[PDB]
Design a protein around this nucleic acid. Structure first.
Ligand SMILES: [Mg+2]
Ligand SMILES: [Mg+2]
Ligand SMILES: [Mg+2]
Ligand SMILES: [Mg+2]
Ligand SMILES: [Mg+2]
Ligand SMILES: [Mg+2]
Ligand SMILES: [Mg+2]
Ligand SMILES: [Mg+2]
Ligand SMILES: [Mg+2]
Ligand SMILES: [Mg+2]
Ligand SMILES: [Mg+2]
Ligand SMILES: [Mg+2]
Ligand SMILES: [Mg+2]
Ligand SMILES: [Mg+2]
Ligand SMILES: [Mg+2]
Ligand SMILES: [Mg+2]
Ligand SMILES: [Mg+2]
Ligand SMILES: [Mg+2]
Ligand SMILES: [Mg+2]
Ligand SMILES: [Mg+2]
Ligand SMILES: [Mg+2]
Ligand SMILES: [Mg+2]
Ligand SMILES: [Mg+2]
Ligand SMILES: [Mg+2]
Ligand SMILES: [Mg+2]
Ligand SMILES: [Mg+2]
Ligand SMILES: [Mg+2]
Ligand SMILES: [Mg+2]
Ligand SMILES: [Mg+2]
Ligand SMILES: [Mg+2]
Ligand SMILES: [Mg+2]
Ligand SMILES: [Mg+2]
Ligand SMILES: [Mg+2]
Ligand SMILES: [Mg+2]
Ligand SMILES: [Mg+2]
Ligand SMILES: [Mg+2]
Ligand SMILES: [Mg+2]
Ligand SMILES: [Mg+2]
Ligand SMILES: [Mg+2]
Ligand SMILES: [Mg+2]
Ligand SMILES: [Mg+2]
Ligand SMILES: [Mg+2]
Ligand SMILES: [Mg+2]
Ligand SMILES: [Mg+2]
Ligand SMILES: [Mg+2]
Ligand SMILES: [Mg+2]
Ligand SMILES: [Mg+2]
Ligand SMILES: [Mg+2]
Ligand SMILES: [Mg+2]
Ligand SMILES: [Mg+2]
Ligand SMILES: [Mg+2]
Ligand SMILES: [Mg+2]
Ligand SMILES: [Mg+2]
Ligand SMILES: [Mg+2]
Ligand SMILES: [Mg+2]
Ligand SMILES: [Mg+2]
Ligand SMILES: [Mg+2]
Ligand SMILES: [Mg+2]
Ligand SMILES: [Mg+2]
Ligand SMILES: [Mg+2]
Ligand SMILES: [Mg+2]
Ligand SMILES: [Mg+2]
Ligand SMILES: [Mg+2]
Ligand SMILES: [Mg+2]
Ligand SMILES: [Mg+2]
Ligand SMILES: [Mg+2]
Ligand SMILES: [Mg+2]
Ligand SMILES: [Mg+2]
Ligand SMILES: [Mg+2]
Ligand SMILES: [Mg+2]
Ligand SMILES: [Mg+2]
Ligand SMILES: [Mg+2]
Ligand SMILES: [Mg+2]
Ligand SMILES: [Mg+2]
Ligand SMILES: [Mg+2]
Ligand SMILES: [Mg+2]
Ligand SMILES: [Mg+2]
Ligand SMILES: [Mg+2]
Ligand SMILES: [Mg+2]
Ligand SMILES: [Mg+2]
Ligand SMILES: [Mg+2]
Ligand SMILES: [Mg+2]
Ligand SMILES: [Mg+2]
Ligand SMILES: [Mg+2]
Ligand SMILES: [Mg+2]
Ligand SMILES: [Mg+2]
Lengths: 130, 122
RNA sequence: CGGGCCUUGUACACACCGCCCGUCACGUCAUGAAAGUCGGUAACACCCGAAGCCAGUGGCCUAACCCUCGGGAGGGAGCUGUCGAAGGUGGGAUCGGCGAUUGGGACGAAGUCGUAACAAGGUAGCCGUACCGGAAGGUGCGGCUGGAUC
RNA sequence: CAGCUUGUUGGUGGGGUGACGGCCUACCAAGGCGACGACGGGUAGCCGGCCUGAGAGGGUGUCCGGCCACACUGGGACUGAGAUACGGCCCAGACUCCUACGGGAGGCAGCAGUGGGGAAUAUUGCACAAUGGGCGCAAGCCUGAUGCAGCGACGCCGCGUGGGGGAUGACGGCCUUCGGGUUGUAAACCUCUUUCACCAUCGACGAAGGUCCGGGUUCUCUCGGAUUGACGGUAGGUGGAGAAGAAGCACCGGCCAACUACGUGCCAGCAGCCGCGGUAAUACGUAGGGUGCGAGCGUUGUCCGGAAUUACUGGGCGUAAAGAGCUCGUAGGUGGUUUGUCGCGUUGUUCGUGAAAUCUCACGGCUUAACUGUGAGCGUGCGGGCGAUACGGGCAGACUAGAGUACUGCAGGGGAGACUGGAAUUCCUGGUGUAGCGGUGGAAUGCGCAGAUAUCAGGAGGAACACCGGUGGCGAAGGCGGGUCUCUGGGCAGUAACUGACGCUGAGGAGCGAAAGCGUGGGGAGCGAACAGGAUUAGAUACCCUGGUAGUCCACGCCGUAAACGGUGGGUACUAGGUGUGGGUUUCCUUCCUUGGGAUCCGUGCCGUAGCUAACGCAUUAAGUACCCCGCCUGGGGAGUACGGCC
RNA sequence: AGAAGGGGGACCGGAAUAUCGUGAACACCCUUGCGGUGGGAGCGGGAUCCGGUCGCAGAAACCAGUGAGGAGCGACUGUU
């Protein structure tokens, strides 16, 4: 078992494709921060933290339209544990030509491309969501 | 496969084959043109092709094709050889240049007249 | 014997009067082995060792310095020694060429011998191994279905 | 190419150098390098750059610029601030030349030039006028550097061979359905202008300079005077007459713009591919027509592209090439939740550097352009300082979810050894008994009449274990079933008692690994390669029949391969269900005795949704969605072959 | 395989007075013996390095392997 962030992305993607309304998954600070970013960008509905048998459990409810369509189109881990990926403020990645979101881990916390270019800081490219 | 596997063992391009072997870097090559003869092509063509055995100045013996209709070649005679395939003769990969040291141009030729060698008219 | 419909297998579609395998014979091309033979390369051990630097010796020569005028100091010629290129001797290494004869390979026409595979291809076929046989191959043992059977 | 190294690795004292240093020496110690490729072999000057490419990349190192190396081949030193000392010295060698034979001389990879090699690459030109260089107080003198010229379409750029009107559808050519169409405003003719070439003439900038003479005393400054330019009487300007001196090459089946006629008739020939030509060829040759480009146009050679056919960006492995036969494990790679710290990675900013030229963007100057100057970019980087701590990493802790241990149960052809049971086949002994038996599609070979086959009793011996038995179980795989005993490995469930990330994978390596085969010894019923006979057949080195050796069995070793298969590497998480079956646990329905239903964990099958796939199909036991590590693929043959090596 | 093929070899002096290695006298304890420990004399052995000397020659005379390559037969030591 390696790369829990990729595990988190895979769980969310599979549930979103299976048309599920919520997911459960072991809670870590990094996952909580990524969930906060996703909610702020509007790709999910609200999330919450429970207390499982051992440790804590993180539950995310997924957002769908009036018809049954997904608000999340894709998801892909970028900086894998076998090859870390970093970027500078000059050349932060662009997702769907700007219609998506790329998560950047900076010394000031997790940020999106817009929030990171407006601050002029780079860092590790965690994942694309769009 | 596996960036670590690539780091340990990089990509290696394919192996090509030299085609200019007798010319060995030169665009043309002089030869002595021994033992001129004729050859029948591969199965579905049934023609009579005019060829020659050329001993090149690169100290290699190759077989060349004589283009055009009608030629003045013979036994020992200096020719200028270039590259080119015939696709029906089995292993001929060289052509005699017409309009060079001993191979005079094609007589009565009127179209394209530069291949095969021919001055316009005077 | 021929025909019709459905279903099954197929490497056939010129459509089984189909496709197709391997020896053998003739020819061409490239290549392996081979008693031996001709070249190249880089070293190694030892012998001999030019110039030259360095180290010694130096009765032969020596203007400046010193001298008690006899010489002394210091220098040089020559000579010896270490190192030393080239050369010589020797045993190997390595890269090529040729070689009577011989092994297979590929391609050639409308050659000879069979018919191994493709249909249950007429003994299901393939895989490993062993023996055998002009040749495709056969047989034994184990395996697989990429075969059948109620 | 797997072992290299003995001044080798290090130390001490000396020596030596401009300088540290095994740079050298005497002594002492026994180290040093290597799978992150030492040692060896091949090739090569390196870079700014150039070509290509969307980029990343790939190829390349020619003009120009920087650095290095060398100067007939090898070695050496001297002089000097400084030496690979190209036109210096010494020695040796090869070569060319002179000689009175004793002995001497030489070095174009400087410019120009000659022979040779080659497909192929230039004049034995002018000037120190400008810039740089050396010596001199200076004037000066030297400079094949340099500045120019000559030659070559070798390349890039620019401009010409006219312009404005004009169906005689001139003439002719070619095609025609013989009616016409086309070349075609194209020509004739009318008119206009002369860029460039031609003729004549004037004539430079490059020179706020170099010289001598005058104010300025000199220094600095103008002044004015001569004089000084190789290019060059050139560029350029002016003037003169005249459309006047000036277009070719390739292709026209598809790619790919461009079609007909005649001749030829698998011939002659064409061709990048696949193809075109055997009597009506848009593919051969000519003509007409057309298309592209144009002082050029084609061919050959080489590089990139297209090629996502080496895939980092950006590919794959069920059946197309591709998962090692399976496991354990070394280096390596990768790593659960959580606290603090460091600030190596990462990221922000600033300073230095990243030469010039080339490249990009904007101007500026040559009549335009190529070319040239300026400014800003670019220069992805590296070094120094100062910030940040989300993530990676290090250091110091913590935790139990992964992993392991403990206890209690459970199922099992898991393995090894020893002993042992019965059915049946064969043979031997005896009884009964008489002429056939055996075998095939049909027969024959064969056995028997010397007593077979058949039948009954006794005995010997080897091998395999009917029913149970299955689709089912166990094992990493290969594999494992007569029974009992002895020894021994793993798995699952429950508990949550313990440790506290101890995990995963794994290049090489090691172990195990069907059958056949090999060695030594034993055993040998049945079966049965080879071998023999019979039959079939044209033949039958086979299929069928009758015999029959090795082998099959055992002990101990070797071998190391299989369609060793799920043709699917291992680990982990997640993503509808339905329905069988093996092993547990478990409430409730607890009797509804039902050992039924439900729930949960671990197996093993079928069917099916999403999803995936070229399709077939896979589908919670993935070939789906993702992450970590490993093996493997790059058209078919030659070939899993040769040579080398290991066993 | 002593494969092949090479190099050194005499004398004198010095290192060298424990140079080094053998044995161990005078003199040092004691369970007093035919005892032990240190001690290092005299007497012998061998090798090296450095310097010098001599001849045509340093293995000095006598003594004391020739070596390599390709076939045939028999494996080999042996026996006649
Ligand atoms: Mg009908
Ligand atoms: Mg079909
Ligand atoms: Mg042949
Ligand atoms: Mg050979
Ligand atoms: Mg000397
Ligand atoms: Mg031969
Ligand atoms: Mg067969
Ligand atoms: Mg057949
Ligand atoms: Mg048959
Ligand atoms: Mg058959
Ligand atoms: Mg047989
Ligand atoms: Mg077989
Ligand atoms: Mg079988
Ligand atoms: Mg030493
Ligand atoms: Mg020292
Ligand atoms: Mg070179
Ligand atoms: Mg590309
Ligand atoms: Mg040299
Ligand atoms: Mg020369
Ligand atoms: Mg020299
Ligand atoms: Mg000087
Ligand atoms: Mg000096
Ligand atoms: Mg020199
Ligand atoms: Mg020279
Ligand atoms: Mg010279
Ligand atoms: Mg000089
Ligand atoms: Mg020259
Ligand atoms: Mg030539
Ligand atoms: Mg020539
Ligand atoms: Mg000058
Ligand atoms: Mg000057
Ligand atoms: Mg030309
Ligand atoms: Mg077209
Ligand atoms: Mg015709
Ligand atoms: Mg034609
Ligand atoms: Mg290409
Ligand atoms: Mg590419
Ligand atoms: Mg990739
Ligand atoms: Mg592919
Ligand atoms: Mg895979
Ligand atoms: Mg296949
Ligand atoms: Mg395959
Ligand atoms: Mg497998
Ligand atoms: Mg490890
Ligand atoms: Mg680890
Ligand atoms: Mg680590
Ligand atoms: Mg971590
Ligand atoms: Mg620059
Ligand atoms: Mg301008
Ligand atoms: Mg910095
Ligand atoms: Mg546990
Ligand atoms: Mg046993
Ligand atoms: Mg018996
Ligand atoms: Mg009887
Ligand atoms: Mg009986
Ligand atoms: Mg604890
Ligand atoms: Mg492992
Ligand atoms: Mg391995
Ligand atoms: Mg074994
Ligand atoms: Mg066996
Ligand atoms: Mg055996
Ligand atoms: Mg045998
Ligand atoms: Mg035996
Ligand atoms: Mg039998
Ligand atoms: Mg038989
Ligand atoms: Mg027979
Ligand atoms: Mg295999
Ligand atoms: Mg198997
Ligand atoms: Mg396989
Ligand atoms: Mg797996
Ligand atoms: Mg997997
Ligand atoms: Mg089940
Ligand atoms: Mg596909
Ligand atoms: Mg299915
Ligand atoms: Mg697939
Ligand atoms: Mg082999
Ligand atoms: Mg071999
Ligand atoms: Mg010897
Ligand atoms: Mg010998
Ligand atoms: Mg002497
Ligand atoms: Mg002897
Ligand atoms: Mg022989
Ligand atoms: Mg003989
Ligand atoms: Mg004998
Ligand atoms: Mg024998
Ligand atoms: Mg003997």
């Amino acid at each position: 078992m390696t790369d829990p962030i990729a595990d988190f992305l895979t769980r969310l993607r599979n549930a979103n494709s299976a048309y599920h309304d919520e997911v459960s998954l072991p809670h870590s600070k990094l996952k909580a921060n990524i969930a906060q970013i996703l909610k702020n960008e509007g790709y999910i509905s609200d999330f919450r933290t429970e207390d499982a048998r051992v440790g804590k459990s993180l539950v995310i409810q997924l957002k769908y339209g009036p018809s049954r369509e997904r608000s999340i189109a894709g998801l892909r881990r970028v900086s894998k544990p076998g090859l870390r990926v970093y970027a500078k403020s000059t050349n932060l990645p662009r997702v769907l030509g700007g219609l998506g979101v790329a998560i950047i881990s900076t010394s000031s916390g997790l940020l999106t491309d817009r929030q990171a270019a407006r601050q002029g800081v780079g860092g590790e490219v965690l994942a694309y969501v769009w | 496969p596996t960036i670590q596997q690539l780091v340990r063992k990089g990509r290696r391009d394919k192996i090509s084959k030299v085609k200019t072997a007798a010319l060995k870097g030169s665009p043309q090559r002089r030869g002595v043109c021994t033992r001129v003869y004729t050859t029948t092509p591969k199965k579905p063509n049934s023609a009579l092709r005019k060829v020659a055995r050329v001993k090149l100045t690169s100290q290699v013996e190759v077989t060349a094709y004589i283009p055009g209709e009608g030629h003045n070649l013979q036994e020992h005679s200096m020719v200028l050889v270039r590259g080119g395939r015939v696709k029906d003769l089995p292993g001929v990969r060289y052509k005699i240049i017409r309009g060079s040291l001993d191979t005079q141009g094609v007589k009565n030729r009127k179209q394209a007249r530069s291949r095969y060698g021919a001055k316009k008219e005077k």
